[PDB]
Amino acid sequence: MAKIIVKKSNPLKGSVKIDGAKNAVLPIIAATLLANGKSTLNGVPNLRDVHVISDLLRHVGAEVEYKENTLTVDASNIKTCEAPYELVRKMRASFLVMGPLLARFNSTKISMPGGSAIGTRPIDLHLKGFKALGAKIEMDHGFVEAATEKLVGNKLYLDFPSVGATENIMMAASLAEGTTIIENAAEEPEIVDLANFLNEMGADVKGAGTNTIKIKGVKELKGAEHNVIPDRIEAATYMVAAAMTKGDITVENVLMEHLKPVVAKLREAGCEITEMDNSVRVVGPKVLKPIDIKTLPHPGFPTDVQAQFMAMLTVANGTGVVIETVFENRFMHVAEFNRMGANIKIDGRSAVVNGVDELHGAAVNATDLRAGAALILCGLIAEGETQIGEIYHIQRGYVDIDKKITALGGQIEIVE
Amino acid sequence: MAKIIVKKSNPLKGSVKIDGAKNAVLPIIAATLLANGKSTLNGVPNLRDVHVISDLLRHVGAEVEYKENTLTVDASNIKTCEAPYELVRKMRASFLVMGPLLARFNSTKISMPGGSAIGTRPIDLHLKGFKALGAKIEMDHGFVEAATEKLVGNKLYLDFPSVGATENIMMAASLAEGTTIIENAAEEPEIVDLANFLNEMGADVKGAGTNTIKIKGVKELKGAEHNVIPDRIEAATYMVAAAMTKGDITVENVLMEHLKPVVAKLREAGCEITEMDNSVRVVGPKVLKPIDIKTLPHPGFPTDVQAQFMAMLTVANGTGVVIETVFENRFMHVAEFNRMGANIKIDGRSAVVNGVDELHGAAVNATDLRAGAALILCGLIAEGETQIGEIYHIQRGYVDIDKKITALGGQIEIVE
Amino acid sequence: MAKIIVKKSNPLKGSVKIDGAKNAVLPIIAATLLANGKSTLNGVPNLRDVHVISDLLRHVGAEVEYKENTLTVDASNIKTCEAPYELVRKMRASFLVMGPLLARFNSTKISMPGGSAIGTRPIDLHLKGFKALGAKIEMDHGFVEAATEKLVGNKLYLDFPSVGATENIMMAASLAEGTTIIENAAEEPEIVDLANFLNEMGADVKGAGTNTIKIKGVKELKGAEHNVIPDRIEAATYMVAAAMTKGDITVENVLMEHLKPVVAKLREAGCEITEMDNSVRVVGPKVLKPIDIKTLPHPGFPTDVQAQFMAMLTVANGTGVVIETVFENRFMHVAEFNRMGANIKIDGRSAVVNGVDELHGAAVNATDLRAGAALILCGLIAEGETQIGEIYHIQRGYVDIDKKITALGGQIEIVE
Amino acid sequence: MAKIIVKKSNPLKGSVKIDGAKNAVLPIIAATLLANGKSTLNGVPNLRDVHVISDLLRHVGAEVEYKENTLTVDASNIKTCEAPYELVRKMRASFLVMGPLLARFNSTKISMPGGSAIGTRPIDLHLKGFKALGAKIEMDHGFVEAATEKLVGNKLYLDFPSVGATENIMMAASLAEGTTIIENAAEEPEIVDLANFLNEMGADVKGAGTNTIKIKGVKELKGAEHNVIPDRIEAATYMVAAAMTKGDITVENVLMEHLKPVVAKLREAGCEITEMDNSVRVVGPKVLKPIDIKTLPHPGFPTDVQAQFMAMLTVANGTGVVIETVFENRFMHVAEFNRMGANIKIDGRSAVVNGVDELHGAAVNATDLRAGAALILCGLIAEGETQIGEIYHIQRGYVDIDKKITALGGQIEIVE
Ligand SMILES: CC(=O)N[C@H]1[C@@H](OP(=O)(O)OP(=O)(O)OC[C@H]2O[C@@H](n3ccc(=O)[nH]c3=O)[C@H](O)[C@@H]2O)O[C@H](CO)[C@@H](O)[C@@H]1O
Ligand SMILES: CC(=O)N[C@H]1[C@@H](OP(=O)(O)OP(=O)(O)OC[C@H]2O[C@@H](n3ccc(=O)[nH]c3=O)[C@H](O)[C@@H]2O)O[C@H](CO)[C@@H](O)[C@@H]1O
Ligand SMILES: CC(=O)N[C@H]1[C@@H](OP(=O)(O)OP(=O)(O)OC[C@H]2O[C@@H](n3ccc(=O)[nH]c3=O)[C@H](O)[C@@H]2O)O[C@H](CO)[C@@H](O)[C@@H]1O
Ligand SMILES: CC(=O)N[C@H]1[C@@H](OP(=O)(O)OP(=O)(O)OC[C@H]2O[C@@H](n3ccc(=O)[nH]c3=O)[C@H](O)[C@@H]2O)O[C@H](CO)[C@@H](O)[C@@H]1O
């Protein structure tokens, strides 16, 4: 089956345009279900996960059309409020329709997400918030059912600043009676994008991007036009590629405010970075300095760039420590890095990376979206040729990584 | 030597006035060193740790006077910029003079804190920030020396939102040339209190209480009058006491905004809480509901209330899980809770608390400030009598816990 | 694709015959490569992993024939000493040919195992032992190469009592010049089975089953007949099934000495167990008592029964704690147990299981061999019907689990 | 108060005689309580912990006399079976009288050990074994009471191969009616010493030093003469001192079988070691090679040498990883190593040691017995002078460390 073949490449040089954020667009597409009218989303990345959540909206009866990075949704005449097992199993972000469906029809039944490549990921905090708003919760044979005679705004505390729980609860709160306060909210940039979209539809959401979000419920929302933010994780991926290949890349159509920790840590590794209004230039160092990273809730270092930074560290000039505080099992890629000649030892949530002279091409498998991109970055610097399998992991969340890297001078080909 | 004797007590009832915050006043006292004039701090708690940092200020040549909860400092004529081993060993918050001394004299030499009761606690992030501002760092026989021809504002990223590092770097930045940006700053309420004090002295600090702090350096600061915020951890301690004893306590002179996670989790345990402008009323439930807690950076659940909430959980109606993400070894109290008949099992950063019918009085030792207060709370509900040793841990950070609990109806006595 | 459908079943009752051990037979099949003649293995289970290692032996030029639970190998005329990427990727126990091939031809080149469902699993200790015996190690593009002018016996210490490293090093040592001592050896029963087979072929291996193994090298080994031990993990699986279903099962063709920790913990859970010479009877309790388990090197509780014991605990009368010390990520099944209505929370290497009234059938996926068997056990007690996917995980390591459970009265069917 | 002053020293050279094992002699002294007559223990080290357990025996009514490394105990006329809070608080190994007292009088009441410097250390497995033998357990105000009409031999499984639980249960089993089997027993050398002593008194204990111990109860035991084994941890301490100081030390009156993991890892670090019948010679390398260690049950690497090996690693030529699997919080010394200029970072149970050019003398505090000895080893190689406080930690478990190191050429003095 399909492989990505990467060869030892030239230093990456040139400009790369970043697509719209996968992780902004998925909750914002769920949010269109809140409105009795037609929404228009611009800057939608042409990814399989976008087309899966689109098909879940079609399943509940919304009208969806996609063309040329625009998606329109008419949620005027939703029929059903069930998310079946197949669609949640395909893409767990499907779970983000639970808040809007509960808000629009006072009842929803959603398949409970199972195992995930990067850890055991409960959705207890989503349910905690729905219960706080007056929903009764019950489990039926793998489905979670939430129902109320009416949502009522309430204060609620998140035990962890969950991105998904913050999104799901903000969307349910947008149509509730009265004021909801989310304490210890996720501060991720996608939370601010979703809030901005809710407000464009007529909502009253304040404090997004801060540790406390206040939602004053409205009776009805209306479809609106929205420009999705750029993908800060895709941007980070190309910035690391510049660092690893001693390259010089200008990343275009980005927001520097969303990239702070990645810029800081790349500068600590020895990159020369020039931040501009709509773009950032990264010049890789001749010798990578070893750095430590610790993944944390935004604006701490993002777990979605952990595997890629770990890849950079495999050839750094000394010992780096990677601590993963956000996910339990997000080290499955380590054994694949080790096949390419890395020196990585893990215990608990920490991985000790002892820099080596160079990596050596090998047959490797992508284990998840971000680790697969990290294996491409390894392949760009590994002596010889690297063959990456299980490439659906990569292709679901990166637009045309082969064409983008090819335009920067790299040697990469997808083969079927 | 000295003991605290607690007996099985009546439900606590009445009002308790909360003192000024230990953890606001210690950095704010360090901050007085920045000013060439006289500062006046009101609402200073009469604690030994306040008198130790006072003696460190005297050692470097400030004029200090304490009376009736007011402390004045005249830092006009500081002489020396060394913090000796004895004073840092007595109280590691002594380390907070490093930023002001570096800012005022471009050189400082500070004993590096050693072992702490609650974990291995490096000060690497403090030094990272000082280096970012242009200080050269070197180690001399247990001392860390920082020196520059001049501090220059710079952007810097905290790998962890360290309270102390945020404080130390904000104070050094206040006199630097140009603008400092602290990314992934601590959002704790004491950070906002310190910033407000710096601004009263003439500084330019914005974003305190948010994930990013911008400091625009000034050439000179002037002594100012400051009212310290209330102790949110002392307040929380009395709120838990009300929960555990099925009592009804009004906690006076508090700020509800600073107590959000404790209020939320006590309500989840079944407390009836009434939040007012300057006070909160807590009515304990008849049956405590088991809850989980996870300690996190503010506004997540505070590690300084973890031992006390764990004590409440020892008699809850089921199984609670306590996860400590902020400190490594903050479970030393568990073996003392177990001596009183608790059922607590730990592995890694998690403690599983299986609620028991009641605790039984025993001889126990305080291991640290907050655990010792937790043993007092255990003693209030434990059948018979509890004798707590190593009471200096408690007395250093709580004003008159014996008199406050006695005024609420509890049976407690300090014996020498 | 293929599913296993399990329905709420009757209490399991009757007798089940246990097959030969997967984990004894795989190293013993590798061991046949040491001998210049024909070996005969009896009691070989008819499993896909047996047929994969058989095809690796064919690849290096051994003559292999399988019929009716007997496998014969003639290794007289081995040609090649390379284990290609495809075969190691299919089954990482392929790595166990490295010791015999190095011993027979003084050179071998073996694909380095990559990611595994249950964790990052390095083979550093195997290489440590080969280096101790005088092999030079080098990495070529995902392959590990070991070569020497001659193996020489030496003392070596295992940092962890690795099963695989103990096996690989014992087999390499069997033909080395002089005496090898393995300190901190694996004490697992399969180590004793392998040693017994090596000695039947003419080797000199003493102390297998103890913490120290001494091998006195011989010049040549000869094919021998060997009876493989029973599968203690399959036996344990049926013993747990009896516990969970309040059944009464006699497990036949087992060795009680190999089952000590499972017998002890099932008795602690309330089972009535009768140990006999060749069989054990398990009578499940009416109410399961909650127990804790901690996985450890033999004779501690086996990690290969952790998922199954966790499944039993999901309906126990209280709170059980499962600690996994042997593998890093062996909790991937938890999210699937939770889909069936379990109450399991994980942090680090510990899982807190809060017993529920009953499980509810759901669509679930096997994540690995032992977890998939655990989902079958869940399915036997879950209200309604359970549909298990990704069933190749199960079928590779269990002989006819559908027929065995059907003969005990359970409702189970494999559908294609 | 008292300090140990260590200066940068010459390479240690010469011979050092090792004392009798602290951890053999403490359970063997408890074991004398089993016998209705007079025991004679030779090779008893002149340590405070020996004199504390001696005073506990006096408290229950045994006749005890100590002179010149011989201790005699006449337990003929024991009166009482209570171990009071003061004595267990002074030394938790006091808990080892519980098994003998329960065996001799069918009742005992023992203060439950509280907090320990190196972790939360429950005694649940001791009680599990006593319950298995037919004792009823209950808690009274910090005391654990065990009582039976008669002990009856039974099979029992240790969830962890606890040294103390193995000792306590073996001693209780020695007078029980019938056969006790301890499954997953501690294999530590002190377990074999205790068993040998029990058998000298008339017991029937087989399998000590293996993973299974069988005790056939007898009606009465008689006092006996016993030679205690050498202290393998003291020996290891001097062997590390030779490694760290590039010295050449012959350690006399030792058993090489008890030192296997320490010898192996020191050889891996580059030491030249010559093992003899009663002694071992260690020649330190010119350059220490970095090694990893992982603490495990014997015969894995001992946790009691972890701090000392960590100290050696602080100046090794690269990165070493220390994993502590046996105790939770056994890293309290790291902050003291860091005061001396080490580069150690911890997360969870792992410490990453990045070797430095040299350590620098500083004021440091001993946190526990073995860490304090490790600070002496640091002090021997640290530039300048080191002053160690809280020296009672060291003095309680090492005989005349000042005189022994002085006789090997080191510069060390105890000052009062
Ligand atoms: C579609 C999308 O935007 N996906 C992203 C989103 O995931 P997602 O929204 O799932 O991530 P969360 O922030 O919820 O998860 C963070 C942690 O919280 C835990 N948790 C979460 C929810 C809950 O109810 N209970 C609970 O315990 C999770 O197991 C995890 O350990 O943020 C992650 C963290 O930056 C990214 O890696 C994902 O790619
Ligand atoms: C005087 C004062 O206000 N004390 C409080 C302050 O401590 P303090 O300011 O020491 O606490 P931090 O927020 O710095 O520590 C949090 C974590 O960060 C780590 N860290 C910190 C600094 C650094 O340079 N590197 C590093 O790794 C620490 O080891 C710890 O694990 O906040 C803590 C967390 O709410 C409280 O428990 C303390 O009582
Ligand atoms: C074919 C076979 O018999 N498989 C079994 C064998 O696996 P296997 O022989 O792989 O298991 P090991 O005992 O080697 O692994 C135990 C632990 O040691 C670690 N380790 C191992 C080797 C090494 O060189 N370095 C290292 O760090 C592993 O990552 C793991 O965490 O024993 C396991 C433990 O009972 C079982 O679950 C497997 O089903
Ligand atoms: C007097 C003596 O000989 N002391 C030694 C003995 O301690 P001790 O006998 O206390 O050590 P154990 O082997 O019992 O402890 C090992 C681990 O098991 C745990 N555990 C132990 C008992 C129990 O009932 N439940 C439980 O969970 C402990 O918390 C610890 O994490 O062996 C230790 C391990 O080599 C050494 O460091 C000690 O110096």
User: What are the extents of the domains in chain D?
Assistant: 1-18+230-416, 21-228
**CA–CA separation, D139 and B308 (whole Å):** 23
Residues recorded for chain D: 416
Cβ atoms < 10 Å from Cβ of C403: 12
Give alpha helix (H) positions in D116-254: 124-132, 163-173, 189-200, 232-244
Question: Ligand 1: which atom is nearest the Cα of residue A369?
Answer: 39
**B47, B137, B160: residue to mutate for ligand 2 pocket, most atoms within 8 A of CB:** B160
Question: Ligand 3: which atom is nearest the Cα of residue C118?
Answer: 37
Chain C residues bordering chain D (beta-carbon distance below 8 Å)? 155-157, 159-161, 183-184, 187, 210-212, 260-261, 264-265, 268, 292-294, 296, 298-301, 325, 348
Q: Reduced to 3 states, what is the DSSP secondary structure of residue C14?
A: strand
Strand order in the sheet with D155-157: D155-157, D179-183, D212-216, D205-206
**Are residues D159 and C187, on separate chains, in Cβ contact within 8 Å?**
no
Under 8 Å between Cβ of A325 and A387:
no
- HEC string of chain A equals CCEEEEECCCCCEEEEECCECHHHHHHHHHHHCCECCEEEEECCCCCHHHHHHHHHHHHHCCEEEEECCEEEEECCCCCCCEECHHHHHHCHHHHHHHHHHHHHHCEEEEECCCCECCECCCCHHHHHHHHHCCCEEEEECCEEEEECCCCECCEEECCCCCHHHHHHHHHHHCCCECEEEEECCCCCHHHHHHHHHHHHCCCCEECECECEEEEECCCCECCCEEECCECHHHHHHHHHHHHHCCCEEEEECCCHHHHHHHHHHHHHHCCEEEECCCEEEEECCCCCCCCCEEECCCCCECHHHHHHHHHHHCCCCCEEEEEECCCCCCCCCHHHHHHCCCCEEEECCEEEEECCCCCECCEEECCCHHHHHHHHHHHHHCECEEEEECCHHHHCCCCCHHHHHHHCCCEEEEEC
Burial classification of residue A59, based on how many CB atoms lie within 10 Å of its CB (0-12 exposed, 13-18 middle, 19 or more buried): middle
**CA–CA separation, A60 and B91 (whole Å):** 61
Instruction: Give the contacts of D68 (CB within 8 A, at least 6 positions apart).
Output: none
Under 8 Å between Cβ of C65 and C71:
yes
Neighbors of chain B by Cβ distance (3+ pairs < 8 Å): A, C, D
Give alpha helix (H) positions in B277-368: 306-313, 334-339
Task: Kindly tell me the number of DSSP H helices and DSSP E strands found in chain C.
Answer: 14, 24
Under 8 Å between Cβ of A357 and A324:
no
Tell me how far the alpha carbon of residue A372 lies from the centroid of ligand 1, in angstroms: 19
Query: CB-side exposure of A341: number of CA atoms within 13 Å?
Result: 21
Residues of A in contact with B347 (CB under 8 A): none
Tokens 């223990």 belong to D41
**Are residues A340 and C142, on separate chains, in Cβ contact within 8 Å?**
yes
Element (H, E) at B123: none
**D163, D192, D298, D370: residue to mutate for ligand 4 pocket, most atoms within 8 A of CB:** D163
Name the nearest CA neighbour of D166 among D138, D207, D105, D226. Answer: D207
Question: Ligand 1: which atom is nearest the Cα of residue A298?
Answer: 35
Torsion sign over Cα B146, B150, B151, B154: negative
DSSP D331: -
Written as one string, the DSSP assignment of D88-111 is HHH-GGGGGGHHHHHHHHSEEEEE
Task: Kindly tell me the number of DSSP H helices and DSSP E strands found in chain D.
Answer: 14, 24
Q: Which CATH architecture has domain A21-228?
A: Alpha-beta prism (3.65)
**CA–CA separation, C236 and C260 (whole Å):** 10
Which residue in the set D319, D347, D354 is minimally distant from A350, CB to CB? D347
Give the phi and the psi of residue B3 in degrees, each rounded to 5. -135, 155
Instruction: Give the contacts of D318 (CB within 8 A, at least 6 positions apart).
Output: A354, D289, D290, D354, D355
Torsion sign over Cα C185, C187, C192, C193: negative
Distance, in angstroms, between B354 CA and closest chain C CA? 8
Q: Which two tokens stand for residue B162?
A: 């360290």
Distance, in angstroms, between C388 CA and closest chain A CA? 12
Q: In Å, how far are A122, A168, C88, C105, C341 from A126, measured between CA atoms?
A: 9, 6, 42, 60, 17
Q: Reduced to 3 states, what is the DSSP secondary structure of residue D399?
A: coil
Cβ atoms < 10 Å from Cβ of A278: 11
Distance, in angstroms, between B360 CA and closest chain D CA? 6
Q: Reduced to 3 states, what is the DSSP secondary structure of residue C399?
A: coil
Class for domain C1-18+230-416, per CATH?
alpha beta
**CA–CA separation, D162 and D335 (whole Å):** 28
Give the phi and the psi of residue A181 in degrees, each rounded to 5. -120, 120
Written as one string, the DSSP assignment of C200-218 is HTT--EE-BTBSEEEEE--
Q: In Å, how far are C270, D123, D135 from D129, measured between CA atoms?
A: 17, 10, 9
Paired with C274 in beta bridges are C281
Say which amino acid occupies A46.
Answer: N
Under 8 Å between Cβ of C362 and A141:
yes
**CA–CA separation, A152 and B338 (whole Å):** 42
Strand-pair category, B344-347 with B350-354: antiparallel
Q: Reduced to 3 states, what is the DSSP secondary structure of residue D81?
A: coil
**CA–CA separation, D237 and D241 (whole Å):** 6
Paired with A251 in beta bridges are A16, A280
Under 8 Å between Cβ of B198 and B31:
yes
Question: Ligand 4: which atom is nearest the Cα of residue D128?
Answer: 24
Give the phi and the psi of residue A270 in degrees, each rounded to 5. 115, 10
Which residue in the set A318, A347, A352 is minimally distant from D348, CB to CB? A347
Name the nearest CA neighbour of D343 among D307, D369, D316. Answer: D316
Residues of C in contact with D302 (CB under 8 A): none
Strand order in the sheet with A3-7: A363-365, A385-389, A3-7, A411-415
Residues of C in contact with B349 (CB under 8 A): 347-348
List the end-to-end C-alpha distance of chain A, in Å, as a whole number: 6
**CA–CA separation, B102 and B106 (whole Å):** 5
Name the nearest CA neighbour of B226 among B409, B26, B408, B44. Answer: B44
Paired with C39 in beta bridges are C73
Instruction: Give the contacts of D305 (CB within 8 A, at least 6 positions apart).
Output: D233, D236, D237, D240, D262, D370
Under 8 Å between Cβ of C256 and C223:
no
Paired with A82 in beta bridges are A109
Name the nearest CA neighbour of B27 among B162, B194, B227, B199. Answer: B194
Say which amino acid occupies D101.
Answer: L
Distance, in angstroms, between C120 CA and closest chain D CA? 16
Resolution of the coordinates in A?
A: 1.7
**CA–CA separation, C305 and D36 (whole Å):** 46
Which residue's CA is minimally distant from atom 23 of ligand 1? A123
Paired with A208 in beta bridges are A210
**CA–CA separation, D144 and D92 (whole Å):** 14
Under 8 Å between Cβ of D73 and D223:
yes
Residues of B in contact with A183 (CB under 8 A): 260-261, 264, 299
Under 8 Å between Cβ of A296 and A277:
no
**D92, D234, D237, D326: residue to mutate for ligand 4 pocket, most atoms within 8 A of CB:** D326
Strand-pair category, B13-17 with B3-7: unpaired
D1-18+230-416 and D21-228 in the same fold:
yes
Burial classification of residue C59, based on how many CB atoms lie within 10 Å of its CB (0-12 exposed, 13-18 middle, 19 or more buried): middle
Burial A196-217 (b: 16+ CB within 10 A, else e): bbbbbbbbebebbbbbbbbbeb
**Are residues A347 and D319, on separate chains, in Cβ contact within 8 Å?**
no
Strand order in the sheet with A272-275: A13-17, A248-252, A279-283, A272-275
Written as one string, the DSSP assignment of C125-161 is HHHHHHHHTT-EEEEETTEEEEE-S--B--EEE-SS-
Instruction: Give the contacts of D204 (CB within 8 A, at least 6 positions apart).
Output: D215, D216, D217, D218
D336 lines ligand 4 (CB under 6 A): no
Element (H, E) at C185: none
Residues of D in contact with B331 (CB under 8 A): 120, 328-329
Element (H, E) at B161: none
Element (H, E) at B7: strand B3-7
Check whether the bond before A299 is cis (ω within 30° of 0).
yes
Q: Reduced to 3 states, what is the DSSP secondary structure of residue D383?
A: strand
Distance of CA B373 to the CA centre of its chain: 13
Q: In Å, how far are B166, C234, C284, C388 from C412, measured between CA atoms?
A: 61, 17, 20, 11
**A160, A166, A171, A187: residue to mutate for ligand 1 pocket, most atoms within 8 A of CB:** A160
Under 8 Å between Cβ of A313 and A323:
no
Under 8 Å between Cβ of C4 and C336:
no
Strand-pair category, D143-147 with D136-140: antiparallel
Burial classification of residue A269, based on how many CB atoms lie within 10 Å of its CB (0-12 exposed, 13-18 middle, 19 or more buried): buried
**CA–CA separation, A290 and A315 (whole Å):** 9
Q: Which two tokens stand for residue C301?
A: 């509780």
Interface test with B, best of D7, D140, D322, D328 (most B CBs within 10 A): D328
Distance, in angstroms, between D119 CA and closest chain B CA? 7
Interface test with B, best of D118, D127, D325, D329 (most B CBs within 10 A): D329
**Are residues B321 and C292, on separate chains, in Cβ contact within 8 Å?**
no
List the end-to-end C-alpha distance of chain D, in Å, as a whole number: 6
**CA–CA separation, D235 and D250 (whole Å):** 10
**Are residues B360 and D139, on separate chains, in Cβ contact within 8 Å?**
yes
Instruction: Give the contacts of A109 (CB within 8 A, at least 6 positions apart).
Output: A81, A82, A83, A140, A143, A144, A145
Please compute Rg for chain B using Cα positions: 21
**Are residues D329 and B334, on separate chains, in Cβ contact within 8 Å?**
no
Burial D144-163 (b: 16+ CB within 10 A, else e): bbbbbeebbbbbbbbbbbbb
Give the phi and the psi of residue C233 in degrees, each rounded to 5. -80, -40
Say which amino acid occupies D117.
Answer: A
Experimental method: X-ray
Under 8 Å between Cβ of B415 and B387:
no
